[PDB]
Write a protein that binds this ligand. Structure first.
Ligand SMILES: O=C(O)[C@H]1O[C@H](OP(=O)(O)OP(=O)(O)OC[C@H]2O[C@@H](n3ccc(=O)[nH]c3=O)[C@H](O)[C@@H]2O)[C@H](O)[C@@H](O)[C@@H]1O
Ligand SMILES: O=C(O)[C@H]1O[C@H](OP(=O)(O)OP(=O)(O)OC[C@H]2O[C@@H](n3ccc(=O)[nH]c3=O)[C@H](O)[C@@H]2O)[C@H](O)[C@@H](O)[C@@H]1O
Ligand SMILES: *[C@@H]1O[C@H](CO)[C@@H](O[C@@H]2O[C@H](CO)[C@@H](O)[C@H](O)[C@H]2NC(C)=O)[C@H](O)[C@H]1NC(C)=O
Ligand SMILES: *[C@@H]1O[C@H](CO)[C@@H](O[C@@H]2O[C@H](CO)[C@@H](O)[C@H](O)[C@H]2NC(C)=O)[C@H](O)[C@H]1NC(C)=O
Ligand SMILES: *[C@@H]1O[C@H](CO)[C@@H](O)[C@H](O)[C@H]1NC(C)=O
Ligand SMILES: *[C@@H]1O[C@H](CO)[C@@H](O)[C@H](O)[C@H]1NC(C)=O
Ligand SMILES: O=C(O)CCC(=O)C(=O)O
Ligand SMILES: O=C(O)CCC(=O)C(=O)O
Ligand SMILES: [Fe+2]
Ligand SMILES: [Fe+2]
Ligand SMILES: [Fe+2]
Ligand SMILES: [Fe+2]
Ligand SMILES: [Mn+2]
Ligand SMILES: [Mn+2]
Lengths: 700, 700
């Protein structure tokens, strides 16, 4: 029964990197005792990410080990720290070390590195890993001292070669009782073994299991090109996120606030941009503490920017527009905004936000800052879809890939603050990180690589984690791919691609309340129901689009109305077919008019078929009235599109058999009445101005 | 200027026949002075209708003329009387006689009769008639005496030959100044000249014009086979019927009544026979004075006769049924009934009435008797058609023909009492005529000729006029030709052939009042109208016909109802298609339901299309209810066919959105409600008995 107080973990760290700090938390979770070598020093160990090196680790260990050269009572484990997490206790570790019968147990690995020719000198192992890895080892302090004291090489000579040569000395191997952890009982090196490692869950703890060997490793080493797979595992192992605990290092449940540089990017035609700009004024962060930079690459959006710039300029403490005439690429524009923050010591946080990011959570900026990370993005998804502003995994050549937990995250079955290889569209970056760790100008530019990926790789290459919070609902992602801007009002056509935003803009704000009851729907005449349907903006834009087309009806035009046996009852009008809006209006019918009708006429069921959908214009100088008639419809929908009094004078609809008149219609409100038999009706004369009406003959 | 007081008309008449009396009225109209020879005597003049004869006329004239043998101051005209009418005044006659320059002017005619060989001895006339006719002549009494005194022949030698021989004596012709009225200036003989004679009308008088010669004859002689054309002209000339006077010899404007023998004849299957028998009880003639004979040749009608015979027997003073088992032909049956009257001196009038005669005028029998004719028929027509119970003219071989005034009579543009060659279906014949003038038994039988024609020819052969009154509305003629008796209730199928009777029997007695307003139509629930439609007899017979078929619906049966999205909402029922009544019911829809709907829903128009027309049966032991649903119809018609309380217990129809229930439906009344959208409805459970309902989904 070895005493855990006789175990000492020694690692090397020249800076307190996120990886190093991640290592310590996993150590502190299990009450390990950790000595860190090298914390102030310059790394002279070479480019371990690109080649051989790391001898400086040994040189430092050798010096440290002179204290313990005679301490047979002490067990020491050496591990890297940037790319290591601990998954089990000192008790289970010492139990396993004893069971190995070794005096110094090195980790094992699939590759004979860095001299592939030496493989033949290694003992033949069966199904186990055959070669030594210096990223982790454990043994008596005396034995370890007898190995490392032999170090006499350059700081950038390779440490693993050095240990390999001593391991392959057969007399030394036998005399000192050196061994390798062939079956990853203690040490799990990820390189060459990704398909052997899976997460093993418990109530308040997560581990890894090697499925090749059915073991539960103590130490997870993301050596070589497996740092990002280790990032993934470190989100869980050992207490990153547990089924019963939730995340462990998150802010969980939520006086001058830091000064923020808010940069808005508009790099494609984007729907609902006026709405986005108006939202900037509502973000719950003191505007004297925010300075706004907006890059617009779209001539399409210049009027939209101009309309709201007076308000933005009055709102924030400083504003700057970079417009299409500067001919900046998105890469150059994002480098510029970020560098404007970098070069201002007063810029404490940098907040990048693309025009397709809809932030429903007004406290987003505060929430992200309070998480206190170098880089953190709020999770944003396409409504009801799996597409989102991050990636959970990378392909072998650093392209897109789907992590095994991606759906769990997007669906918020697992919520927390995740270490992911790619984020986009919104993120908050610490000013000091820009100054001290990513000082270059070419963050997004410099290669043919697309900027959004260049950005993420810049941070990954420095070992800066890219964090992603799905801890709260933050907002959504607008669809922008096939946005048709060849309309007077393109957002009218957005009904299929952005239905949630389309409804917020164009459906009446009180529709849903009226659909749910609450005494809003009225019945002005027998079986004629009256409810709010269209917002004023929808009315205005639809009329506008109609006049912009301009081809109103005239003589010899025929509608589906029935009067006086067989006569011709026409209106001056434009059908949806003509302006290319029929599919759109039919969707509004299926989605919003169908369910209201079924609720007002219990027992009736509808798919909201309608062949005749047209806007009617009334004027005293062309066609001011519409004589008594019936409609070819089961029911008729009649929506007012402008204001009685303001835009026209004169009455509206009259139902003759009920001697009931709808005078004073309401803009955006719709009448619902039967089309046949009972509700013979006429449109009263418009006496001044112009009357606009939207009508569909449903279920003909 | 010859003095009319010096003119004397002499004719011959052995009996005061209708023709003779007709002659006198035309004479009295113009104030002629007429001496009649032969009134008491037996006619020994032969068969003038069949051969030569008439010498007795001359013998009597010769005797008469000895008084006037020297009276040069006197002008005498001889004419027949049975077949003669006068059309002009003695003044115009004497004026024309003088203008002829003759001393004795004989009528002229187309045929050299009765010795065709004598034609060559006659003077050549141009376009005029070339030969003598003894039916009319006029001359000085001295000259006429010198001609007739030569008569010394047999009573049945031919008189016209006798005058012809004296005319063809050229010396006598010259010496006595004998002439013929070649151009019908005074005398118009009809035989051989029918196409020369037309009626010429004046305000209060009618004449004839010869169009060959452009003359206005004084004397119209229907000689030979032209008695019936003369009958026709005598209806008008001279004061029979005038444009401003109407008829002249009619009863125009209307204490034991004569005893009548009423004979009813049923010689084919006849629709609405129960109704006809019931009508017999309503004829406004004291039933103690009527004795009823009914011949039925139809086993089809035996139950109908049996049902009402108790009532008939109690009503009239004596009744007699002759039924199918006696195997009488209609001819033998009509001979029998008529002979029962003939042989009863107490039978003062005989009234024959066929089963297809609908007498709407209850005072018919009185009206006909008060006209005081030997034989008289009320005018009866097919509703709205030209077909009627008389003929105005005969073909050359005594078959059917259409008189030139036939349409004027049927349409009652000319009303009066007409002398026509054929009557049928109803007529009143004087008992004394049967006894004294038509004593034979074989009136209708005896030849292959059909009885209806044999009857008329029997009377015509005796010179008895067949009179026809269109002076009042008397009734109508049922159509019987293609009556289908292969139904439990054949009169249900009579909708197309006898619509007026069908409506009186099967349409509700208060329908038309309700169609016209008058607060009968109710609106028990919003836009559900309630009106009387079917009589109780129609309800009973339709249900009966339905059960007689018996093939009610069951499982897997599908109707055009809409509920709960897509589900199966069926009834236990029989569609009209199945019992062969759909065309019928569709007509009832077009004729009675269409117009009511258009009046209750102003602005709506209908041809009353309906694919689904079915009777529903409700019972607690099969299908007692009908769950909430909509109908595939613009509007639905729902007619109750039996009595709540008497035939069933339990509620009826409920309209869910109006929380309005039609409990207690009315037998024969119909609901009218929209089929779609607003009027979701269910049929409440029938809890005792059986519920029958008639339903059509109109305008699907
Ligand atoms: O020198 C080593 O220890 C190993 O480095 C690489 O493999 P790798 O595990 O990916 O190296 P890292 O884990 O990225 O860095 C090695 C350790 O050196 C320390 N280090 C490294 C770099 C640095 O700037 N500061 C610093 O403290 C960290 O503990 C770091 O984990 C080489 O491929 C191995 O052959 C070599 O044995
Ligand atoms: O004897 C005649 O006077 C003529 O009778 C027929 O021609 P029609 O004019 O048709 O004879 P009717 O008019 O039917 O009868 C002749 C007249 O005799 C009188 N008459 C005849 C029959 C009779 O039973 N009682 C009677 O009084 C009537 O005035 C009767 O009109 C013959 O065809 C002629 O040749 C003949 O000249
Ligand atoms: C949506 O419904 C709200 C609640 O009834 C409406 O609100 C009122 O607006 C009137 C004038 O516009 C004010 O005088 C009231 O004080 C408001 N009431 C509340 C509770 O805020 C609102 O007008 C409706 N929206 C539209 C577009 O009609
Ligand atoms: C047709 O309408 C008449 C008039 O309203 C109905 O007549 C009444 O019938 C009730 C009972 O049947 C009597 O008590 C009233 O005295 C009647 N009124 C008159 C004015 O006669 C008649 O019932 C209706 N016919 C049907 C078949 O419903
Ligand atoms: C770590 O040590 C503390 C005593 O300072 C003890 O209370 C705690 O339970 C230990 N945690 C574990 C996981 O052993
Ligand atoms: C017939 O004679 C009477 C006199 O008795 C005379 O009043 C009447 O006008 C005459 N009618 C005609 C038509 O001459
Ligand atoms: O002017 C109105 O409100 C009635 C017009 C109407 O209902 C129609 O389009 O047929
Ligand atoms: O039982 C009733 O009165 C309602 C039945 C009905 O309307 C139907 O035939 O669909
Ligand atoms: Fe139109
Ligand atoms: Fe309309
Ligand atoms: Fe059915
Ligand atoms: Fe129904
Ligand atoms: Mn490492
Ligand atoms: Mn004659």
């Amino acid at each position: 029964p070895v005493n855990p107080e006789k175990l000492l973990v020694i690692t090397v760290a020249t800076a307190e990197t996120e990886g190093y700090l991640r290592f310590l938390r996993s150590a502190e979770f299990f009450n390990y005792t950790v000595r860190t070598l090298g914390l102030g020093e310059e790394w002279r160990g070479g480019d371990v990410a690109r080649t051989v090196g790391g001898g400086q680790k040994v040189r430092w260990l050798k010096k440290e080990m002179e204290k313990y050269a005679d301490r047979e009572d002490m067990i020491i484990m050496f591990v890297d720290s940037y790319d290591v997490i601990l998954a089990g206790s000192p008790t289970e570790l010492l139990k396993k070390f004893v069971q190995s019968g070794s005096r110094l147990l090195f980790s094992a690995e699939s590759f004979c590195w860095p001299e592939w020719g030496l493989a033949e000198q290694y003992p033949e192992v069966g199904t186990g890993k055959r070669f030594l890895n210096s990223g982790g080892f454990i043994g008596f302090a005396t034995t370890i001292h007898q190995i490392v004291r032999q170090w006499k090489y350059k700081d950038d000579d390779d440490d693993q070669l050095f240990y390999t040569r001593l391991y392959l000395d057969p007399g030394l191997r036998e005399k000192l009782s050196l061994n390798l952890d062939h079956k990853s009982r203690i040490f799990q090196n990820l390189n060459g073994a990704l398909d052997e490692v899976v997460l093993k869950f418990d109530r308040n703890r997560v581990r890894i299991r090697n499925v090749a060997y059915d073991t539960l490793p103590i130490v997870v080493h993301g050596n070589g090109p497996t740092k990002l797979q280790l990032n993934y595992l470190g989100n869980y192992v050992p207490n990153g996120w547990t089924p019963e605990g939730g995340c462990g290092f998150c802010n969980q449940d939520r006086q001058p606030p830091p000064r923020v540089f808010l940069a808005v990017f508009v790099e494609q035609p984007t729907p609902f941009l006026p709405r986005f700009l108006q939202r900037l004024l509502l973000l719950d962060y003191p505007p004297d503490r925010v300075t706004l930079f907006l890059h617009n690459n779209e001539v399409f959006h210049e009027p939209h920017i101009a309309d709201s710039w007076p308000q933005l300029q009055d709102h924030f403490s400083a504003v700057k527009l970079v417009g299409p005439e500067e001919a900046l690429s998105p890469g150059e524009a994002r480098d510029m905004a970020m560098d404007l923050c970098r070069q201002d010591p007063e810029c404490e946080f940098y907040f990048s936000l693309d025009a397709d990011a809809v932030l429903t959570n007004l406290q987003t900026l505060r929430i992200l800052i309070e998480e206190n990370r170098k880089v953190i993005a709020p999770m944003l998804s396409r409504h009801g879809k799996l597409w989102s502003n991050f990636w959970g995994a990378l392909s072998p050549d650093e392209y897109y890939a789907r992590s095994e937990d991606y759906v769990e995250l997007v669906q918020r079955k697992r919520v927390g603050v995740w270490n992911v290889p790619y984020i986009s569209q919104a993120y908050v970056i610490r000013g000091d990180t820009l100054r001290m760790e990513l000082p270059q100008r070419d963050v997004f530019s410099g290669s043919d690589t697309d900027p959004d990926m260049a950005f993420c790789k810049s941070f990954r290459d420095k070992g800066i984690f890219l964090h992603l919070s799905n801890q709260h609902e933050f907002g959504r992602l607008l669809a922008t791919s096939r946005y048709d801007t060849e309309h007077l009002h393109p957002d009218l056509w957005q009904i299929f691609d952005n239905p949630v935003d389309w409804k917020e803009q164009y459906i009446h704000e009180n529709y849903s309340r009226a659909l749910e009851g609450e005494g809003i729907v009225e019945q002005p005449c027998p079986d004629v129901y009256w409810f709010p349907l269209l917002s004023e903006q929808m009315c205005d834009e639809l009329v506008a689009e109609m006049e912009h087309y301009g081809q109103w009806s005239g003589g010899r035009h025929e509608d589906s109305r029935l009067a006086g046996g067989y006569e011709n009852v026409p209106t001056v009008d434009i059908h949806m077919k003509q302006v290319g809006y029929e599919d759109q209006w039919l969707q509004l019918l299926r989605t919003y008019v169908g369910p209201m009708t079924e609720s007002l006429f219990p027992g009736y069921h509808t798919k909201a078929r309608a062949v005749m959908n047209f806007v009617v214009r009334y004027r005293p100088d062309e066609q001011p009235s519409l004589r008594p008639h019936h409609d070819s419809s089961t029911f008729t929908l009649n929506v007012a599109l402008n204001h009685k009094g303001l835009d026209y004078e004169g009455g509206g609809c009259r139902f003759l058999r009920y001697d009931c008149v709808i005078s004073s219609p309401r803009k955006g409100w719709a009448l619902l009445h039967p089309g046949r038999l009972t509700h013979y009706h006429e449109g009263l004369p418009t006496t001044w101005g112009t009357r606009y009406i939207m009508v569909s003959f449903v279920d003909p």
